[PDB]
Amino acid sequence: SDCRTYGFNTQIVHAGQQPDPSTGALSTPIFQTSTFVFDSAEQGGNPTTDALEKKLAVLERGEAGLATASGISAITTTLLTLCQQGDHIVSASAIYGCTHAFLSHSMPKFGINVSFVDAAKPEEIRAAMRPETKVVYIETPANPTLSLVDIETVAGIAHQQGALLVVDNTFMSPYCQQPLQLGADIVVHSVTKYINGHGDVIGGIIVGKQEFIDQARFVGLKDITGGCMSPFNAWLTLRGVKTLGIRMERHCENALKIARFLEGHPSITRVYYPGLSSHPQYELGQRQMSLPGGIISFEIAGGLEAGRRMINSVELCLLAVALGDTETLIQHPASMTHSPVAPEERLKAGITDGLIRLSVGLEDPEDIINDLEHAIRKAT
Amino acid sequence: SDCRTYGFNTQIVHAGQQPDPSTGALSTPIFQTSTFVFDSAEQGGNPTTDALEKKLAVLERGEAGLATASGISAITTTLLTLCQQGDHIVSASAIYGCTHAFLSHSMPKFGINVSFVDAAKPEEIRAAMRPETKVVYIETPANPTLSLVDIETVAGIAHQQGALLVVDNTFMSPYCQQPLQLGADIVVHSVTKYINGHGDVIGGIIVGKQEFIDQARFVGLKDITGGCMSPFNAWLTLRGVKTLGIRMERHCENALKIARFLEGHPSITRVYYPGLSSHPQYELGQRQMSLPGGIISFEIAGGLEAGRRMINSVELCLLAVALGDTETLIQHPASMTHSPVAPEERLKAGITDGLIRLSVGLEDPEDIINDLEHAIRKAT
Amino acid sequence: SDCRTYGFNTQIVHAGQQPDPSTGALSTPIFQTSTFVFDSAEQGGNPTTDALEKKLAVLERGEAGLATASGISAITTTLLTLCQQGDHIVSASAIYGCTHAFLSHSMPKFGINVSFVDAAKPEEIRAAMRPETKVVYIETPANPTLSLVDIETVAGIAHQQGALLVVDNTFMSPYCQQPLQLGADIVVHSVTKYINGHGDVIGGIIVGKQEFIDQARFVGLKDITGGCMSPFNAWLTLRGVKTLGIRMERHCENALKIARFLEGHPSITRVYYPGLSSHPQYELGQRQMSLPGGIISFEIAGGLEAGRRMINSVELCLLAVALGDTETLIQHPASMTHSPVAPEERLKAGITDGLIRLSVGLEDPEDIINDLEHAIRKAT
Amino acid sequence: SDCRTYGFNTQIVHAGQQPDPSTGALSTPIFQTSTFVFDSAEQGGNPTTDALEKKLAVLERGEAGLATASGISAITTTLLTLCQQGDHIVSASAIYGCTHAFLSHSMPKFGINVSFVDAAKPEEIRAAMRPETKVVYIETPANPTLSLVDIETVAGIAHQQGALLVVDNTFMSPYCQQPLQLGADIVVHSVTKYINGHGDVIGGIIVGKQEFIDQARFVGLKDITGGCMSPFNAWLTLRGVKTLGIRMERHCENALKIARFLEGHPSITRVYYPGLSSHPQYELGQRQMSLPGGIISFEIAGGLEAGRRMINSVELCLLAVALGDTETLIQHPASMTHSPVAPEERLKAGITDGLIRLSVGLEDPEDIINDLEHAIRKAT
């Protein structure tokens, strides 16, 4: 039939894939090749990566997909394909770190100017648009406090003023949020997170209209970034995404239990999780997201030293900066990642001294809660 | 000891690699991971790719290496790290195709201007340099007639006028040519060709000073192209380069036999191969290159239709646009790759209607010569 | 801590694995090596496969694990380690096909005699035991009608008469059944099915006492079958088993829905599924198994030609002889696998002309039911 | 054409392989699958492993090939397919270690008796043959002193008395010796050594008549050992064997240089290498082998402690028990492998206290000789 007609779990398993016609092999073969041969002068890929691109296009409800070497390369291949010297971008402030350096330093050195705004306030996006604006760029939920962006409202604003909307959907995966259905033009992912889900692949994906994807492929990849994804990485990502539906269900079930535990804990001052009623944009989240996600941020009493003591006291949670793996991962941005940054700068970059970020995995939630309770008790 | 002190074949086998300290594993483990874990807050890669980078740095006699997703990404990560709007590049005209589009269209849209010159004439390079020139870019030997560029002379010119020299060494590999030893600042490769050699990896490498490579890594890769190489691709390239010395010796031994056969054939009007005395820059080749290479170009009598008939008549040689594999590969640019291009344009892009390009593999040269003789006889 | 102390889902994720001490890599590195190096004469693996063996030992609650090249090799390495000429085996009749040939022909040619019994009747096992009996061998649930064997009762019988009990736990996985906890001495799996779960690995595992596993390793593998598992296959199986808990939950949830649908369908004469109340050993199943499994057998009205027409009319279910993959798979033994076998022989081997076997995958059960309903309607 | 008609180097590159018809992929795809799908009931592998089997069959000049999980499994799958209780085997004494345990202990426990003889004396083979003898089994060259066996003469003897001849050709590879051309019936290899050559694959291969190979596959593998090779291991072996010709040429060129150096060294009492004129079977070697091999044994003055001191003093050669890798490997059996064995037993098992075994790699021979000279000087 047509894979676009089946239920979402069926699509997760089947879309973009079929038994090998030649051999009947059910698994997508790994076409680990660089060389393709022609039969004739007149009549003179990659099939593995093509399957991944088609599957993700189906899952995001877009026309076409393009796999890349990294999440970074998905974003830069996209924006460098769309923009040239003299052009302008309006970008959310609450965005991924390496994206910020690309937008803050790299783009301006190529004559491409960027205005950063608080995208939780759609009026700030509107006010920053210029005749030269080609692209509005947002991420949602956004780090570090998991604030949201109203995709449908921002898309309407962008389009009225003649710009494209590009959305980073990494945190959600297509299982939980579909920006193209809400009016975005282009979706990008780091598949490194939930789409692969197994913490063993660095890669990205771009999904959008065929017309744009062809330009991203034949100009962006070929003539600017060279950021192709290897066939083995595509095969692993295909393998990982088979369990996307059941993984996201369990991630989100576990995260909600852990978030409620943290909200009831007197040593925890704040808990940021879209699944909690006290989230500032809770109702927007319920319309825009099918599940509240696997990521939690929370603030422990006692600031910087309590945060340090807490992550040094966990025994099951692993200390790492990654997200979306099968293992529960924990990090303390003020002592770890943003440690060279001046306090007052971190402080309304949104990173308080006591802020902890947690990527909830597939372990028994009882074991994770026990580990957290033990570490919090010690840290305070 | 120090791997920088052993003979070149010993370095090919050993440089950048050692038994795994933890386990004693002799093969470099495949660190197929995205996530790395920290032991503490205070104390809070990729090891496979690191081994490849160190090996190639040793082989090129450079300080440091940086692996990339493709040969394209090696070149663009390099140039986009070095140049910003307002800067200038002097580039050889006789360069790889996708490189030309990057230099002709992409760079100028970022405000970076490029002048193309005939790099076989070092005076044209000098005459094109401007106060804004940051980089001189060359490839040697160069397609399609395997003309050469005098690296040492061009390096001297570039440096006197305050620019860096970047050399694409893909065609030669470090076994046959070492541009850094001749004064180049930066070497780039598509490892897709001879360094891997097995036609199953797309990838690139950049080699140069530690100071530059750190910028290419932490700014170029991280903040512009995102073009990282996957650990499995790095492991395969490490595996392939183990036989670099013995592969290049046989490629070049076979190519010289085939080139001499073609030079004696009355249906072949011209043969381009640096190992032949009639090559226009033969003596330069003997000083600059340790072996004349595995690539041959030649012109068959009868123009476009003879070229078409010839490649349609080979039965052992395979029709493909790739180079540097273990199989002998053949292509006819006028009918294949550059077929949409207007004849008169191709004609002193250097591509005549009868031009055939041959990548000589590891087969018995007698079998390749027999296949060629048969196909030439039919085609004419 | 000790991985033997956490909840089962936590064990699935973490047991046998830890961040690489040397590098911090979270994923288990792929030690694709044959050679291990020594530091000295005095002081003169595989680490990937070791992680898999330790994980499965923890999940089955056994002391030690041994990975093999195939499910077949797990069974034969076990039995050939335990038995020599003159010894005797009592085996269930309702067993996997290739196992039957090994037991029926191969063992007797080595002087090892085998008696086959109906293991659903523990008294038949007792009556077949001899002074020479070393091993009782069973599989449960058993094909093709998913009959059960009471592991605890059979273990007691075997042990009283001085024999070991070996159980094939492939159909269940350790998530759903733990034979060692019920008194079995040794468990074997084809990891090809649910433990890997992704239809891309052929492999086996043996779990039991350290004393036995050492003999299976240093004598069975090294000196009889040579059936080692490759490190890459072990790494893929480690990756697959990460989602074992969530996969089995969904397989079993989907299978129960599909089984109830089939039980209500007037064109379906019988449905065999341990989760249905009418299963002959339903209560035994509830004590012995935590979930009823992902495999269903059923008989369609109209015998051989209806069965043929049905499998030729499915459009989502895939025709294959495999089990335990993420895709729903279907087969018709009488027309497919056992087609060369005489009808009357198949008929109380348990294989009726109308019998269909179904491996339920991770698709939306509504889509699978719709596909089945369509195919059944056509077939009848 | 027919790959059986090209030169041996051409066969090494091309035999068993072709561009993928479906996609044009030049590299053999990795069919990492367990499941194969059928299109119909009526019409209801592995393609990667099949390519390897066909290539090695062509190279050994046999009809068919069968890949296995290990060299051990190649040997045991073969012999257990051929022999049953009551049968007899005549085997060389000078054979690989794990093979000896299989033949000495395992076979007799299955009622299969084995007589061990000195196969350098063909008359000992004849004298040991019995009416029950099914197989004569030899290895050549043989460890540890690299003695030879006259394959053609032994084949004639075996056949006159109605037995098959099985030859282990691991040490030589098909590039240097072709036992089937000399009258052997069956050839086995550990591909772990030279056929793969890169020290990262454990695997075996069996080559012989189609009639036998079908029995080894459908009975030996399926119903006795279960020792299949994984598709990824087959793909790596295919990749490794591409350079077999150029690797063996360099291994043997380097080994001859090193052997001549050792023969001239006054601290070295004996050197065992078929390429040296003083080898006891030198002329037989020249008829039977195209090159003298990459393996050298030699005795250092001063017995056990000198041998220990020597291997502890090398700085380039690596200490390991493996053979046939790209790195030079060294071992001292009396202190390392056979250390638990009583001296007088080792002593005319052929292992003297001063015996060193060397696997010569692809490094510059000057560097290896320098390392050896340094270590020998220290050790004495």
Ligand SMILES: *Cc1c(COP(=O)(O)O)cnc(C)c1O
């Ligand atoms: C991690 C991340 C990226 C970058 O992904 P890589 O594959 O590591 O480059 C981009 N966007 C978001 C939202 C991320 O979390």
Ligand SMILES: *Cc1c(COP(=O)(O)O)cnc(C)c1O
């Ligand atoms: C093929 C080639 C490249 C590009 O390599 P990819 O890995 O295919 O991007 C660059 N330079 C030269 C000289 C080449 O031949």
Ligand SMILES: *Cc1c(COP(=O)(O)O)cnc(C)c1O
């Ligand atoms: C498939 C199967 C086996 C054999 O597994 P392989 O890995 O294919 O050898 C053994 N036992 C049972 C119960 C099976 O279903």
Ligand SMILES: *Cc1c(COP(=O)(O)O)cnc(C)c1O
């Ligand atoms: C190493 C070796 C074997 C066994 O090979 P594995 O792949 O390690 O089982 C068999 N025969 C010979 C001659 C060997 O050297």
Ligand code: NA
């Ligand atoms: Na699939």
Ligand code: NA
């Ligand atoms: Na190595």
Ligand code: NA
């Ligand atoms: Na892990």
Ligand code: NA
């Ligand atoms: Na090939």
